[PDB]
């Protein structure tokens, strides 16, 4: 049945239903087999914010470390609650931009620098001198959002990390996380590969190298000891080859929580979000869950105050369309449950009319004389957001149809064409073909020049009698 197949396909565009807050649990009622592995999860709620997505920090380790009132989570300060970044669908084009408080002078590559959360060095035991946490980290004035490259020589560093923290964590699975176990640890300083210069080869728990990060070594031959001279240029993972897409990137986050140190009163790192680069395959863990901060106390682009947090907000641009914002709890069936990266060329969102026709959805709102990129950007900014304060801005719009004044939106004019953006809060059931239109979702990249066709199962002739 084509109608059934159409509904099954169009399910991937039902963002409020499918962009959920899930947690991993072997007794969860939700499941999906991806390749050889059956993933199990619980859906805590639906309709997670797309622009900014949060849910309460969930820690099912035996000690429940990051659920403690004394655990510092970056969102407590910036949002007012201990939130992890949430949302089961990969968010294409979404980058955490460093901005002024009014959103101007945005910097969409600053995030690649490491954080300065006053963590490293965590210990200086046996060192000739001491140093406070923070001393080894990149200068506050160049702080980004990327998680530290690594910690200790490898993870799990000892069998107690593995047996007391990892295996008894209800979100951990030794098969899914088979690259960070006792028998197959994730290497930061690989001592099995000595060099003429030093007794190890440097890798990283995440990333492909080349970034500004903390000085893990210090200036002395006693690795980890003060003094430090950041920034240090990071190296890449020893083996990133299994990270083939955004969901695999989320697995790197899922599995590496216990690789980071936590002591009462300090930052507790868990369920970290990540950036995936579709063009290079790089998976980079982010150290912060915060996605938007624009309070009067936010630092605008540069500060020396290590107790301040930078002004940031999510942004999409045509040029950011290779980037993907991925939460730790990405759903393994996302290809069939979530929108694809590319906008959809030459179609209009609709709902089924009289069985075998499609009528356009009813617009909630419109924007005139916009570009297609602007349509996708504003859709994103008007979609949904957790954290309360942006509720007056977001409207619940997850689908938009751009109608060019006189450009075929599959041709080269698409990148500069102006026209009208129509915004919708209705779940779509079908698509109508048109030469002069392009369809966006709030999870789509916003470059009209990469737009592709939907599956033709979605497309029906227009009901022109409405």
């Amino acid at each position: 049945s084509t109608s059934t197949s159409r509904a099954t396909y169009m399910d991937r565009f039902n963002i409020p239903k499918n962009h959920v807050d899930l947690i991993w649990d072997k007794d969860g009622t939700k499941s999906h087999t991806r390749g050889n592995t059956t993933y199990r999860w619980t859906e805590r709620k639906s309709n997670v914010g797309v622009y900014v997505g949060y849910s309460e920090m969930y820690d099912s380790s035996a000690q429940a470390y990051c659920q403690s009132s004394s655990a510092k989570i970056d969102t407590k300060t910036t949002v007012g609650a201990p939130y992890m970044a949430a949302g089961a669908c990969p968010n294409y084009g979404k980058v955490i931009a460093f901005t002024k408080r009014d959103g101007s002078r945005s910097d969409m590559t600053r995030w690649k620098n490491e954080i300065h959360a006053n963590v490293m060095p965590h210990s200086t035991t046996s060192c000739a001198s001491r140093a406070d946490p923070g001393a080894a980290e990149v200068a506050k004035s160049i702080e980004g959002f990327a998680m530290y490259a690594g910690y200790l020589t490898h993870c799990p560093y000892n069998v107690n990390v593995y047996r007391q923290d990892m295996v008894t964590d209800k979100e951990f699975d030794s098969t899914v996380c088979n690259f960070v176990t006792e028998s197959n640890p994730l290497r930061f300083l690989d001592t099995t590969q000595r060099q003429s210069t030093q007794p190890y080869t440097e890798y990283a728990f995440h990333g492909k190298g080349g970034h500004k990060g903390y000085d893990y070594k210090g200036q002395t031959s006693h690795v980890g000891c003060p003094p430090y001279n950041p920034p240090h240029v990071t190296k890449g993972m020893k083996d990133s080859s299994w990270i083939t897409g955004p969901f695999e990137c989320s697995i790197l986050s899922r599995c590496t929580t216990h690789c980071w140190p936590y002591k009462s009163g300090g930052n507790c790192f868990r369920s970290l979000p990540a950036m995936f680069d579709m063009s290079t395959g790089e998976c980079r863990l982010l150290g912060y869950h915060t996605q938007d901060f624009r309070s009067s106390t936010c630092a605008e682009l540069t500060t020396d105050d290590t107790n301040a947090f930078y002004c940031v907000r999510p942004m999409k641009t045509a040029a950011s369309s290779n980037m993907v914002y991925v939460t730790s709890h990405t759903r393994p069936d996302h290809e069939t449950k979530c929108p694809p990266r590319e906008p959809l060329k030459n179609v209009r969102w609709g709902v089924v009319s009289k069985g075998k026709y499609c009528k356009p959805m009813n617009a909630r709102a419109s924007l005139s004389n916009a570009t297609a990129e602007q349509c996708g950007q504003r859709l994103f900014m008007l979609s949904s957001a957790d954290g309360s304060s942006l509720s007056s801005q977001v409207r619940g719009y997850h689908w938009a149809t751009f109608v060019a004044t006189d450009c075929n939106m599959g041709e080269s004019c698409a990148a500069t064409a102006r026209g009208k953006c129509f915004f919708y809060s209705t779940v779509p059931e079908c698509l109508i073909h048109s030469p002069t239109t392009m369809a966006f979702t709030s999870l789509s990249a916003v470059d009209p020049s990469i737009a592709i066709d939907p599956d033709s199962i979605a497309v029906l002739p227009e009901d022109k009698c409405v």
Binding site: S68, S123, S126, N158, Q198, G224, W260, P261, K263
Partner: protein
Amino acid sequence: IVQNQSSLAPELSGCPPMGICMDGTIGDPIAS
């Protein structure tokens, strides 16, 4: 004091603070 195992690790290592000794050798990872 509440801390996770990776936080405690350098205090148990034979080669603190990161697991590489002054002479470039490693671990006993749990030496005490």
